[PDB]
DNA sequence: TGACAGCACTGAATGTCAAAACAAAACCTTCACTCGCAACTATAATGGGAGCTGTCACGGATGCA
């Protein structure tokens, strides 16, 4: 029941807070109980990562912006540490994903409509 | 049985050298067209002015005289 609160606010706050499970403990509970909590509901929420990294990934190819905003404006650490998470995730390198003129659905994780 | 607390373990990822790479093209040679300096030519013709001035005028100065 409760936790359904927190499916869009982190559609909305992936953004200026940077929310971590500690940040995330502020929706009621504990950092541990949380997670399963979560995870009976989804089956997979730390979700974040994939939001953070779909979320940057509005700005890739949607705003004009270059690369170093966005490795930090959504609340990733570095821009290597977003490109470790960017090519675990979708095999490639955000310059040679942006500047190719196609792109489809290979590595960005959908949102949580549940 | 009830809901919910916070520890246990697991794995993925984060931080690690590295050369694989592509482009800032800036730092070098090219090859050249052109822009640049240097030399000659052999009826023969032999003193500049040069368009300007416009009459200030004393006390002073020296130079001669």
Redesign the pocket.
Same mark, same amino acid.
């Given at each position: !029941?409760?936790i359904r609160d927190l499916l869009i606010w982190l559609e909305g706050h992936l953004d200026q807070p940077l929310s971590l499970d500690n940040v995330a403990a502020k929706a !009621?509970?504990? @950092?541990?109980?949380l997670?399963?909590?979560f995870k009976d509901v989804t089956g997979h929420i730390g979700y974040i %990562?994939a939001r953070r990294l779909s979320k940057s990934a509005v700005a890739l190819r949607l705003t004009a912006r270059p690369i170093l905003d966005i490795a930090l404006q959504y609340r #990733?650490?570095?821009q290597?540490? #977003?490109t %470790?998470?960017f @090519?675990?995730?979708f095999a490639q390198t955000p310059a040679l994903y942006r500047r190719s003129p196609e792109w489809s659905a290979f590595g960005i994780r959908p949102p949580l409509r549940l």
């Open positions: !029941g409760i !009621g509970y504990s @950092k541990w109980h997670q399963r909590m %990562r #990733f650490d570095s290597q540490t #977003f %470790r998470a @090519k675990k995730q």
